[PDB]
Design an enzyme around this catalytic site. Structure first.
Site, PDB file in Angstrom:
ATOM      1  CD1 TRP A 100      -2.201  -2.180   1.743  1.00 46.65           C
ATOM      2  CD2 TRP A 100      -2.952  -1.229  -0.137  1.00 46.65           C
ATOM      3  NE1 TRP A 100      -3.194  -2.983   1.235  1.00 46.65           N
ATOM      4  CE2 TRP A 100      -3.668  -2.427   0.078  1.00 46.65           C
ATOM      5  CE3 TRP A 100      -3.248  -0.455  -1.270  1.00 46.65           C
ATOM      6  CZ2 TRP A 100      -4.678  -2.868  -0.790  1.00 46.65           C
ATOM      7  CZ3 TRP A 100      -4.253  -0.897  -2.143  1.00 46.65           C
ATOM      8  CH2 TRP A 100      -4.953  -2.095  -1.892  1.00 46.65           C
ATOM      9  CG  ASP A 173      -2.894   4.287   3.765  1.00 44.71           C
ATOM     10  OD1 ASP A 173      -4.049   4.351   4.249  1.00 44.71           O
ATOM     11  OD2 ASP A 173      -2.600   3.516   2.829  1.00 44.71           O
ATOM     12  CE  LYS A 198      -8.768  -2.018   3.552  1.00 46.87           C
ATOM     13  NZ  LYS A 198      -8.421  -1.205   2.398  1.00 46.87           N
TER      14      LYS A 198
END
Lengths: 364, 367
Positions: A100, A173, A198
């Site tokens: 990511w 993030d 999430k």
């Protein structure tokens, strides 16, 4: 109700689903669904203010930060971040601890803003990282606009226990660990963001939290107007129609987190959950997680067969995920790039689900 | 249930709300909500495939067009359009018939792609246009990448009955009339797009329908990767996580439209409702609408106090608005830019609601 270990979109508190079901045709005694209500109307403007403040209070977000709800996932914010926060600076730093953070680095590279050095602090990570590379190996840039990193890598299962100590403002993030524990070191932070799917509900929406001095920086040219975070802040995140259901449902989850005793309570439960899962991989000879204790994620717990990191076998993995599916332990298949297995246990994952997975693994 | 005339987000079929609530904790016997399901799993990939196909069936979208579901409203697509479709052309044409086409024009002008003439075809629209400017006054650009326009202007209530005839491929904002009628003449179309929150559900999501040779054009520098429509097509709109609940809910509405007889049936029902509202405006001395009958929207019906176009009075407006609100006829307040009144009546707007509105307008003691 199955035990769902999906990485994203993920399990949600059952209470929130039940409240949404029961409010669906008539919300706030309005004679309308929350889906059907004008965003310029009184009812919606209350709901959005409430959601913002609830988040402000849950996180203890200081007075010198703005809180934003915006359409688009984390991947859209990867683009927006350099458009908004490079300013006049001649370099940006990305610590790529996994997939990511690497994707966010790749997006900033590919966009190729003139005169700006896009610098990978520890280079590209290896195929199967065991840790975060040592602090003394980090290559930092002179005129860094920010230091980007991912607080919790979902596919690798690598999580920072604390924020890195660097001179540039952090951009973080937090997609896969947002509201999973408190945030304490706000002085180091330039921006924090997270997609919603999430730990707080629907896909297609993200939270962005920005330190006010960061938005004084000039936006880069060719920035889409709605991805200019100054324009968002100016218009109350209603320059155009915001993702109203997502903010509504996130607000219900914020209420639920408060009822469970704030973020400290979430951190304890998540630690208790992760303790039981990691022990069940370690002590059992059929499963292996190579990540070291210092960097082990409380949210995402990947594991493979004893030689599964190096030898990919789709048939061998398939039998264990079916064995789990058959007993209502769903979505334990790992991310395609690595294969193998992954238990994702966010805030809404109950201990009952964790004990059930432990019992299933112990009977393999 | 109130009579909901909100321009956006808008009324939805009650059946769809009831269906969504009934399976909220367990979707198709999976053990989980549609909200909790992985986009890479088997169940979601079937739903999105089905939703795409169903939309293709409803519209009879020909096979030389891709269909996208994307995160973000119509305003994000105003930005993405020029990034994606200028190509190597030196000009783009925008016909501005009202507020949204003008907004789309302004975003392209703002972005300022070097060497591209951003041309307004009929000039900036007046404060209260009564028509689309006549075709023969349009000044088109020589090497135009596309001809951009808004099929239905929500605030002005100006709607095209048929697609314009121009050399360049059409890029059409159908946000406020998408799936309110059939679409023909696909050969004229480069791109059609629509945000979901008027006629197919949740805000935060748009449909983009793109002719395949348009994506053979090179993307302009600095395009965010998720806004490059080639990247979306290449990854079946799952380059990253798609807005799953919006797509699922859109699909429920697509089914509902099929159940009611398709897009031609929607067009007939929407014309019936519109005709009643316009006859209530026109036949009553207390209300006026200036839009020529050939340009009158079926979806958004502004109307004013007799002198309300040029003489604003929010207090006088407030009297009829509250008259309507006290009868549970909600959001008849017109857009802030124009004041006065607006009935927005999309597919899901019940005939009963229109009947209640017409009665209120007839019983209003007057200005």
């Amino acid at each position: 109700r199955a035990y769902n270990f999906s990485a994203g979109p993920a399990a949600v508190p059952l209470e929130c689903l039940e409240r949404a079901a029961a409010e669906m045709t008539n919300w706030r005694n309005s004679g309308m669904s929350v889906i059907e209500v004008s965003h310029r109307g009184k009812h919606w403007m209350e709901e959005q203010k409430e959601a913002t403040e609830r988040l402000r209070t849950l996180l203890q977000v200081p007075e010198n930060f703005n809180i934003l709800f915006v359409a688009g996932g984390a991947s859209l914010q990867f683009s927006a971040i350099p458009f908004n926060f490079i300013g006049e600076h001649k370099a940006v730093d990305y610590l790529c601890t996994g997939t990511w953070s690497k994707k966010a680095f790749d997006e900033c590279k590919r966009l190729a803003f003139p005169g700006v050095t896009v610098n990978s602090v520890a280079g590209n990570p290896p195929a199967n990282p065991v840790e975060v590379p040592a602090r003394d190996t980090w290559k930092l840039s002179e005129d860094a606009a920010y230091f980007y990193y991912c607080d919790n890598e979902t596919i690798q299962g690598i999580e920072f226990q604390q924020f890195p100590d660097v001179p540039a403002p952090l951009i973080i993030d937090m997609s896969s660990n947002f509201l999973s524990r408190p945030i304490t070191q706000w002085e180091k932070v330039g921006c924090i963001f997270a997609c919603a799917q999430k730990n707080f509900g629907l896909a297609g929406m993200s939270v962005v939290i920005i330190r006010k001095d960061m938005l004084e920086r000039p936006v880069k040219p060719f920035c889409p107007i709605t991805m200019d975070y100054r324009i968002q802040v100016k218009n109350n995140c209603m320059y155009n129609t915001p993702p109203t259901f997502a903010i509504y449902f996130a607000n219900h989850i914020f209420k639920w987190i408060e009822e469970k005793g704030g973020l400290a309570a979430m951190d304890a439960l998540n630690k208790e959950k992760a303790k039981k899962v990691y022990e069940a991989i370690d002590s059992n000879p059929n499963f292996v997680n190579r990540i070291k204790p210092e960097w082990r994620s409380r949210m995402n717990m990947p594991f493979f067969r004893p030689d599964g990191y190096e030898n990919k076998d789709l048939d061998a993995d398939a039998k264990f995920v079916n064995f789990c599916t058959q007993r209502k332990l769903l979505t334990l298949k790992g991310h395609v790039s690595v294969g193998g297995f992954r238990a994702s246990c966010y805030n809404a994952c109950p201990m009952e689900a964790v004990d059930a997975l432990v019992q299933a693994m112990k009977e393999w």
